[PDB]
Write a protein that binds this DNA or RNA. Sequence first.
DNA 1: ATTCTGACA
DNA 2: TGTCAGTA
Lengths: 83, 84
Amino acid sequence: MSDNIRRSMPLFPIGIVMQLTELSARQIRYYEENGLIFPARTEGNRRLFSFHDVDKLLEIKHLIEQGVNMAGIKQILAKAEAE
Amino acid sequence: MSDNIRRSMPLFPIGIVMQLTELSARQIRYYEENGLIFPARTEGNRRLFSFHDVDKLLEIKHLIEQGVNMAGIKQILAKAEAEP
DNA sequence: ATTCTGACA
DNA sequence: TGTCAGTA
């Protein structure tokens, strides 16, 4: 689908992503290091997130607020990719 | 489908369940405190688990071993029960 | 013997 | 969660 390719185009910088998700750059990096999201990189090596990335990050923020731990986050996001 | 009635049928007590799921009574009862399971009761308030409860209990064990906490499991089971 | 609820040297 | 307690 042209949709999935659109939802995957990397274009969002860490700056807005932090404002919207309310996550620290540190946390964002952490979820990336755990394979939860996959932000490509520019020429300046700056991170560029995709819509699916930001969408998942908003979900991570939400699960955190509900008390879900890292293990939970992983299971859920994984079972979402399998849906 | 006279199977569901048999699966939702109270047959074994906490002690047998422990043997079928390798879960302690503390754990088994604890998951109940979180609304994860709804075991039927007898006249003596003794829990009688059905086949459905044991299955739903094996699921919890899998996640529990995966490091998922109660909040995580509530979140997971909540969806796995509304989709199918 | 077996399970139950509450509680924490 | 373990576990000891005091029952039912």
